[PDB]
Subunit: 153 residues, 3 copies
Amino acid sequence: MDVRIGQGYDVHQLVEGRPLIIGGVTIPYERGLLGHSDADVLLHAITDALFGAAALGDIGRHFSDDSRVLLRACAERVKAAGFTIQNVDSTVIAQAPKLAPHIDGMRANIAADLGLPLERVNVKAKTNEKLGYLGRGEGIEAQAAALLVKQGG
Amino acid sequence: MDVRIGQGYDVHQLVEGRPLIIGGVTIPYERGLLGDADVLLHAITDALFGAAALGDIGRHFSGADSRVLLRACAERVKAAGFTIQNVDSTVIAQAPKLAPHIDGMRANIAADLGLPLERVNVKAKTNEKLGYLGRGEGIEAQAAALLVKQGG
Amino acid sequence: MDVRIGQGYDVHQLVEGRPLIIGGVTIPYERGLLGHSDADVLLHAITDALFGAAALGDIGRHFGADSRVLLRACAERVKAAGFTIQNVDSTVIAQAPKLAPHIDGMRANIAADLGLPLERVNVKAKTNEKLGYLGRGEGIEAQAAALLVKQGG
Ligand SMILES: Nc1ccn([C@@H]2O[C@H](COP(=O)(O)O)[C@@H](O)[C@H]2O)c(=O)n1
Ligand SMILES: Nc1ccn([C@@H]2O[C@H](COP(=O)(O)O)[C@@H](O)[C@H]2O)c(=O)n1
Ligand SMILES: Nc1ccn([C@@H]2O[C@H](COP(=O)(O)O)[C@@H](O)[C@H]2O)c(=O)n1
Ligand SMILES: [Mg+2]
Ligand SMILES: [Zn+2]
Ligand SMILES: [Zn+2]
Ligand SMILES: [Zn+2]
C-alpha cells in the first residue's frame, strides 16, 4: 500500500470578546480566535496535514480571499487525487480554557467531515505550562498528523 | 496493514531545586523540570495514545512515575489490538548537551515499549537562543509514533 | 511492509544583511539566516526527519558541506541502512516574506536530493500571526515528517 505522511500547524491570537471555536466546537470563554476565517486553529492544521500527505500544497494554494466547509473540500480534493485516509491525530495547545469536555464534539465534527469513523480520529489537549505567548493566554496552537494511502485500486 | 500515525507534545519549566530527568535519564545540571516532569516520556506516551485513538495522558492518568505511565500506555495500546512499528522524537533543550545521554534514553524507551533499540529514535536540538526555550526557561519534546491495528 | 515514521525540527535567527536560503532557494529579503552552515532550516528539519525514521540518530551524530550536500548524504546513509523513502511533508513558519512562489523550487531541490519524484515531496508555509520571535521576524522555523519502508520485500 502506497502510504503517505502529512503534518500541519496553525496558530491564532486570542483576543477579548470574540468567539472561541476549536475543531468546530464553540467553547464559552471570554477570549476568542482572530483570523480571516472563523479562525479554527485545529481544523486548519488538519486541513494542511491532509494536503501535505497528498502533495497538494497547503490551504493557501487552495483557499484565499467556515473551516468545516474547507475541511470537507480538502477531503474531496484528497479523494479525487486518489487517496484514502487512514487516521488523523492532533494536539491543541491552550493554556485555558479546559478543552477535555469538548474533545468528543471535535472528533465527531472532524470524522463526519472526512468521511471517517470516530476511531480513526484523535484530538489531544495540552497547556504550555505558562511559558511564552501560548502560556500567557495570547494565542492557541494546533498540530496535526495524518496518514493517507494512494490507491492502489 | 492498517497503519496509524500518533504525534505528541510536551513542555516543562526549568528551575533551580529540581533534578533534570529526560527520557528517564538524570542529567547532572544546576537546573531541572517542574511538574516527575519527564517531557520526552510524556510526549511519546501522547503520540502512542494518539495513534491508537485513545485520547491523551490526562484522559488516562489522574504516585506513579513517567516510565510507569509509559509502560501502562504500551499495555493499553497493545490491549486495544495495536502493534508498534517505531518511535521518533526531538528534545529541544538549549543546554545541557544531551548527546551522551541519548542512548540511555533509547534503552529506557525501548524496554518500556517492548521494542528493539532499532525501532526507537531520540534527537536533540538547541533553540538557537530564541524564546523561552533558547533562554533556558523551559524544555520541549516532540514525538511521532507509527502503530499497526491487527489485523491478525 | 515495514513502515517507519520520522519527524524533524530546526530553527534559525534572522538578522539584517545575510542571505535568506530555505529549501536550497535563495529568497531576496532584507534579512537572512544565521548559523554555521548556510543555516537552511527546511533542509535540516527534513534531514533530521530522515535520520529519525531510520533510527540513525540526528544530523549531529552524522555531521565545507552546505545543507544540500548533507541532505544527499543523509539519503545515501538511509538507503544503505536498507530503507526506501515513501514521502516527505514539511512546514516553514516565517512571518515574511511570502514563500509561495518559491515553494516549487524547494520541492524540486528536495526531490532531486532524495531521488524522489516531485509528487512525493511537499512543502507548506505559515506565518505565526505576529506572535513570539517567529511572529516578530526574529527567527524562522521548519517542521518536517517523513515515511520510510525498511526492505524487507
Ligand atoms: N511566509 C509565508 C507565510 C504564509 N504563506 C502562504 O500564505 C497562506 C496563509 O498563511 P497564514 O495562514 O499563516 O496567514 C499559507 O497557507 C501559505 O499559503 C506564504 O506563502 N509565505
Ligand atoms: N486546555 C487544556 C489543556 C489540557 N487539558 C487536559 O489536561 C491534561 C494535562 O495537561 P498538561 O499536562 O498540559 O498540564 C491533558 O492531558 C488534557 O487531558 C485540557 O483538557 N484542556
Ligand atoms: N541540548 C542539546 C542540543 C543539541 N545537541 C546536539 O547538537 C547538535 C546541534 O544542534 P543544533 O543544530 O540545534 O545546534 C544536535 O544534532 C545534537 O547532536 C545536544 O546533544 N544536546
Ligand atoms: Mg513550537
Ligand atoms: Zn488558521
Ligand atoms: Zn509533561
Ligand atoms: Zn538548522
